[PDB]
Amino acid sequence: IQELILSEENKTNIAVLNLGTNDRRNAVLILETALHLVEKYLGKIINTSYLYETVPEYIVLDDVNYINELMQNLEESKYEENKELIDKCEEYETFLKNGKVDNSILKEVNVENYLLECNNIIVKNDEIMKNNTSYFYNLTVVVKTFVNDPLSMLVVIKYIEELMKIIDIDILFFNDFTIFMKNIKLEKNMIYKILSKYIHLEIINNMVDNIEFLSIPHVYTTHRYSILLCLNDMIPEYKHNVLNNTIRCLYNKYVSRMKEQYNINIKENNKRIYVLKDRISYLKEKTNIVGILNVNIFVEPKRAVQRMFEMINEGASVIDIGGESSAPFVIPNPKISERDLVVPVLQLFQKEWNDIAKPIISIDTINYNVFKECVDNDLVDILNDISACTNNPEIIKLLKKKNKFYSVVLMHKRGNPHTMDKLTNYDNLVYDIKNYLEQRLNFLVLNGIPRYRILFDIGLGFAKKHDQSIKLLQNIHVYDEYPLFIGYSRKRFIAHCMNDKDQLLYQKNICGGLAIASYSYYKKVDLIRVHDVLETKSVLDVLTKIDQV
Amino acid sequence: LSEENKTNIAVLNLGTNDRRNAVLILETALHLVEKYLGKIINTSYLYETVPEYINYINELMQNLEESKYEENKELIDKCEEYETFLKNGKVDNSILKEVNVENYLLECNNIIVKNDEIMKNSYFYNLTVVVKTFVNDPLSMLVVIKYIEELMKIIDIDILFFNDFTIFMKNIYKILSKYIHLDPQEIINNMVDNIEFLSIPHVYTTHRYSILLCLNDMIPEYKHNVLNNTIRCLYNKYVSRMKEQYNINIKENNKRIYVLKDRISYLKEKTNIVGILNVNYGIFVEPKRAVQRMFEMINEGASVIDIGGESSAPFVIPNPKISERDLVVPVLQLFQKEWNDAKPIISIDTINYNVFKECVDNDLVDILNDISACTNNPEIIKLLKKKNKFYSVVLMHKRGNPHTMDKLTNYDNLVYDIKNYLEQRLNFLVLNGIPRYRILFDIGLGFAKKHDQSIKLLQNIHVYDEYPLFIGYSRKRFIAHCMDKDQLLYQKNICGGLAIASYSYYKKVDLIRVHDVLETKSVLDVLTKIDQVKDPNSSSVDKLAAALE
Numbered sequence A: 001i002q003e004l005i006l007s008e009e010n011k012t013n014i015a016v017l018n019l020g021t022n023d024r025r026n027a028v029l030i031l032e033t034a035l036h037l038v039e040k041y042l043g044k045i046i047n048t049s050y051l052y053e054t055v056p057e058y059i060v061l062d063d064v065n066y067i068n069e070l071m072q073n074l075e076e077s078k079y080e081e082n083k084e085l086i087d088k089c090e091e092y093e094t095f096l097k098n099g100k101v102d103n104s105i106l107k108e109v110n111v112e113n114y115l116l117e118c119n120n121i122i123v124k125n126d127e128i129m130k131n132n133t134s135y136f137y138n139l140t141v142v143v144k145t146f147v148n149d150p151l152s153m154l155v156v157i158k159y160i161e162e163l164m165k166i167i168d169i170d171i172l173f174f175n176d177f178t179i180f181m182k183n184i185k186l187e188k189n190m191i192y193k194i195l196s197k198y199i200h201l202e203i204i205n206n207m208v209d210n211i212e213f214l215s216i217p218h219v220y221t222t223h224r225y226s227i228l229l230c231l232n233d234m235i236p237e238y239k240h241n242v243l244n245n246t247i248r249c250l251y252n253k254y255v256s257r258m259k260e261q262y263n264i265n266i267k268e269n270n271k272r273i274y275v276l277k278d279r280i281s282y283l284k285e286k287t288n289i290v291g292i293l294n295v296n297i298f299v300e301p302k303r304a305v306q307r308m309f310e311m312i313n314e315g316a317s318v319i320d321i322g323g324e325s326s327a328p329f330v331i332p333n334p335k336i337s338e339r340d341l342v343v344p345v346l347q348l349f350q351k352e353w354n355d356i357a358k359p360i361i362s363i364d365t366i367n368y369n370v371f372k373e374c375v376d377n378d379l380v381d382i383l384n385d386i387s388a389c390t391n392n393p394e395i396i397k398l399l400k401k402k403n404k405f406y407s408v409v410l411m412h413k414r415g416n417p418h419t420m421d422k423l424t425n426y427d428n429l430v431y432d433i434k435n436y437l438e439q440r441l442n443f444l445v446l447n448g449i450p451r452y453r454i455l456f457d458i459g460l461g462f463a464k465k466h467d468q469s470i471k472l473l474q475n476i477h478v479y480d481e482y483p484l485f486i487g488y489s490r491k492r493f494i495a496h497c498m499n500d501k502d503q504l505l506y507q508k509n510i511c512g513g514l515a516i517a518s519y520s521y522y523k524k525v526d527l528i529r530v531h532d533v534l535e536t537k538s539v540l541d542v543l544t545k546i547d548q549v
Numbered sequence B: 001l002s003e004e005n006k007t008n009i010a011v012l013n014l015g016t017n018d019r020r021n022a023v024l025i026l027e028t029a030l031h032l033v034e035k036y037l038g039k040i041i042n043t044s045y046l047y048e049t050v051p052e053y054i055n056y057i058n059e060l061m062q063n064l065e066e067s068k069y070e071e072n073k074e075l076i077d078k079c080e081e082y083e084t085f086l087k088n089g090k091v092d093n094s095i096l097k098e099v100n101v102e103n104y105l106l107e108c109n110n111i112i113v114k115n116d117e118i119m120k121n122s123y124f125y126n127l128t129v130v131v132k133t134f135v136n137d138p139l140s141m142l143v144v145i146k147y148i149e150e151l152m153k154i155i156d157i158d159i160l161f162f163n164d165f166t167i168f169m170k171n172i173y174k175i176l177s178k179y180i181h182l183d184p185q186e187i188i189n190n191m192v193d194n195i196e197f198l199s200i201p202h203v204y205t206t207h208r209y210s211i212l213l214c215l216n217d218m219i220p221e222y223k224h225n226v227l228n229n230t231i232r233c234l235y236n237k238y239v240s241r242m243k244e245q246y247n248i249n250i251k252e253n254n255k256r257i258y259v260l261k262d263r264i265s266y267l268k269e270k271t272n273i274v275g276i277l278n279v280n281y282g283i284f285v286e287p288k289r290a291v292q293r294m295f296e297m298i299n300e301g302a303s304v305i306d307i308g309g310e311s312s313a314p315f316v317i318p319n320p321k322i323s324e325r326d327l328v329v330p331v332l333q334l335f336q337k338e339w340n341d342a343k344p345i346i347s348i349d350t351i352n353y354n355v356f357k358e359c360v361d362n363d364l365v366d367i368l369n370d371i372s373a374c375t376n377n378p379e380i381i382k383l384l385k386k387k388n389k390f391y392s393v394v395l396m397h398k399r400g401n402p403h404t405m406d407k408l409t410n411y412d413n414l415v416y417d418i419k420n421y422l423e424q425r426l427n428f429l430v431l432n433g434i435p436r437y438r439i440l441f442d443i444g445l446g447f448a449k450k451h452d453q454s455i456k457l458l459q460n461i462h463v464y465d466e467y468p469l470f471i472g473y474s475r476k477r478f479i480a481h482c483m484d485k486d487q488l489l490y491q492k493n494i495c496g497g498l499a500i501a502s503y504s505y506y507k508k509v510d511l512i513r514v515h516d517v518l519e520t521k522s523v524l525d526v527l528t529k530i531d532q533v534k535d536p537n538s539s540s541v542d543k544l545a546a547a548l549e
């Protein structure tokens, strides 16, 4: 046993994990805590799915902050975290192609015997659930793991569950292994021996009976929509030996089956979630206003915070604060740094708020030093990185603490405010931008940023002719599966669509922006970045009322 | 030959190719059918139709030969003869040779199969009518018709039915001079060659789409002995079969027209801004400041200006000393001159006969906006026919007056009672020879409606998809209910109206009556441009290109 389960040599395996909770109000905190412990005790998170609200799947053939106290009382992993950015992952590529990995230390079964044994568990379980309420919140994760084998991983996983005391963590795959092991009898000091390999130990009694069998792939992989739903996000092309098709085909048949033989439409009550700060947002259910706070003429901290408060009351859900202009052909005031403009205002807002519904704060920056200071001093919620984190990808390290994750807007542009209007050739405008953003998400997701925390922005007016900016909006449907953030507010292209002189075109432009708000409303754009919050709020309130039947 | 004095029901077809002047043409045609044949008691819409396979008239009106009969301009509740025609009850025997049921079938089919050969060696502007006729026979009709055809100089008047009759015949001054009081000798020599035969019903009646389309407007439930079904059933089968067999949506090239002044307007193709000029908005009225605003509005983007001296806003006290026509007629008079010193249509918001008579006489207005759907003084309908020229009309639903309406709020079925009410109203004007294509529907937002009821009327605006639709939401209390002080509420209200503009835009509402023209115009311009899609295939074509790269 010590020769193989606890062998000296360090492996690099690929595991695919499923995460569940039943707590709606704390889902993010429960699941992101699980993610941290996974990242801490198992290896490196290299993929995540969206977060979903899922209808319970019991039959196949049809509130407290002790977590935060746990998070200051953890044993150290015997394995080191490396936060360095990676570009690729060999073992992961091998996993997906299904190619040649090490032999399993745990005895495998063939397809026939897997199918008989998986099948058996289901009928037993179906009739059990036949004889004898709340939504599930689900998430899948690919971990590049240093744990030797699936059984050892399940042990560590069980520890993670007891520590968190609400949470359910399943191993879906482990390399290309087919494993069915029926009557696991694990010794009280075997569990300790396993845990000690991976953790510097300072519960074990509970675990002994909790592992009765091991199935790889998990029994319910092909039988739960909610699982297939999550896997389709991460590994759509994957074909394990024990599966009839790729994950995408399996997901697709399941959608069309519920439609062609049950007339259900299964997507309707299995909602995709994104996360702006710490609450659940249902994808495509609200057009949130993001109020613009431009800090540069120098804008005084007190006046700027006044403007923030005004915006909250005008109905902004998110304030985007920026001290470095991206507007065409500008150059900043050299006398005063981005941080000097930005940080004081955010410090003053935090003081002025704490004296007293709290707006989410986004910082429009591409600069590591500025974002580091903001995050250290709990001043911000979201990075609005207009370079899609390409200017300094080290900024991605700042999006993860331990317990906490930060959300991020990824925007498309080329060049800078002086060059961008010239950088306007695209072979396939709509899809070049779309593919660029997906590629940027992939890189973030490979580097452990949760998928459901990443927002897409097409960068209107940035290296786009006015007709091109229009075409991007005409084809906004292309982002129907994704959290979407856009900024049209007061841009030159609005004016290009139109027919005291100086103050007149100013007005037509704000008024034209409200047409794009209306359009965004009907296209179900998740976030809109605007200067004129009150006007935008008035439009959206009325459009919302016309929809309440 | 030409003896007795009787009354018959006569369905006509009216055609033209002159798109630019189809109104001036067909309404001269209509009036000559009013002078020389009897009384117009039904019309269909104007239609631009595909033929299925792919300045002198002003003086002609001063010099017309008068009918032997008198023009009865007075209103009617119903027509007994027309009601008999519709059920095919007992009418007189024909003063012409009527053929049997199975012989007409064979005699018509040869004229069809002969005629798709002589043709086999532009746009159609169609309009049907129903006439209470003093003429005793189809042929004497066709005689005065071809006289009318020739008397113009581009016009094809046909007879589609004549009571219950089934006629075929193979092959004048005495007819003309006993119906009408006599270079007039170019006519009779043309006519003798021009008239060749007579078929009742008309030959193409059951084959041409352009006719079933027109007949569906006027007489849906009408069933001839000849035709194997009701007009509605034939029409709906023609639509259903062009879809099932040929895969054509047959409506798309056969467009319903409404008319605001003298030009063509394609139903549902444009949301027109109607600028509000309410003269009664301290103690002195400024007739020059109001023409200022008319011009300001034209420049701001108004197609139409609605002027009213009488206010119908809630609980309004009408100016006790100065009258409606002194508020309105000189403000209009000033306008007419300074314009003569791209001409906007002028709508007068009045229920008052004398005011409209005075505006119509002095060429000051094109449209009657009647907020009582002409129930205050049904006689006002008579002023919509200066027998040469016609005028269009907005018919609006309300109950009570500005002090009682807020209470008058119980409907049996809100949406449909109002639709039925306006339809009945249209039927009245039509039965009295107001051309169908000149009657606009208004649901009267805020007029005897609770705020939720104004919203419910909008939610269900699709119910008017067949009809020209004029609405007025601008600045009404219901907008506000949906959402250094008191300044906000004014702004919020205007900004929330722009939502309704946008909704109106997408719901294809034909006219919107607004205060804030510029703001509205800006929203409509941007929405229009977003819908201006260069290639309708490109979104799937670009998507495929991307998936292949």
Ligand SMILES: Nc1nc(O)c2nc(CNc3ccc(C(=O)O)cc3)cnc2n1
Binding pocket: A326, A327, A328, A364, A384, A386, A409, A411, A457, A459, A460, A461, A462, A485, A486, A487, A488, A490, A491, A492, A493, A529
């Ligand atoms: N995520 C995000 N998304 C934007 O759209 C954005 N825009 C600006 C402002 N930048 C511009 C760019 C172009 C133009 C013009 O052509 O007028 C104007 C302003 C700043 N931060 C931004 N952040």
Ligand SMILES: Nc1nc(O)c2nc(CNc3ccc(C(=O)O)cc3)cnc2n1
Binding pocket: B312, B313, B314, B349, B369, B370, B371, B394, B396, B442, B444, B445, B446, B447, B470, B471, B472, B473, B475, B476, B477, B478, B513
């Ligand atoms: N065709 C037409 N269609 C209208 O909608 C309209 N409205 C007014 C203005 N009347 C009102 C009624 C209600 C309200 C409120 O609730 O605020 C305000 C103004 C005047 N002429 C009108 N003419």
Ligand SMILES: Nc1ncnc2c1ncn2[C@@H]1O[C@H](COP(=O)(O)O)[C@@H](O)[C@H]1O
Binding pocket: A154, A168, A169, A170, A171, A172, A210, A211, A212, A213, A214, A215, A216, A217, A218, A219
């Ligand atoms: N691949 C697997 N992942 C997680 N649990 C498993 C797996 N195979 C078997 N099990 C067992 O299934 C139970 C997990 O709890 P539940 O999710 O309620 O079934 C435990 O007894 C596990 O040992």
Ligand SMILES: Nc1ncnc2c1ncn2[C@@H]1O[C@H](COP(=O)(O)O)[C@@H](O)[C@H]1O
Binding pocket: B142, B156, B157, B158, B159, B160, B194, B195, B196, B197, B198, B199, B200, B201, B202, B203
């Ligand atoms: N029901 C009918 N109405 C009008 N003209 C008819 C009818 N039946 C036969 N005709 C004749 O057929 C010709 C048809 O003309 P058109 O339809 O303009 O090609 C006319 O010149 C008439 O003399």
Ligand SMILES: Nc1nc2c(c(=O)[nH]1)N=C(CO)CN2
Binding pocket: A019, A020, A021, A054, A055, A056, A057, A058, A136, A138, A168, A226
């Ligand atoms: N949708 C959904 N249904 C379930 C889940 C789950 O995670 N999601 N877990 C279960 C027992 O582990 C039983 N049923």
Ligand SMILES: [Ca+2]
Binding pocket: A038, A039, A040, A043, A044, A045, A080, A081, A082
């Ligand atoms: Ca790690």
Ligand SMILES: [Ca+2]
Binding pocket: B034, B035, B038, B039, B040, B070, B071, B072
């Ligand atoms: Ca008459």
Ligand SMILES: [Mg+2]
Binding pocket: A019, A020, A168
């Ligand atoms: Mg579960």
Ligand SMILES: [Mg+2]
Binding pocket: A168, A169, A170
């Ligand atoms: Mg489980």
Ligand SMILES: [Mg+2]
Binding pocket: B156, B157, B158
């Ligand atoms: Mg003809």
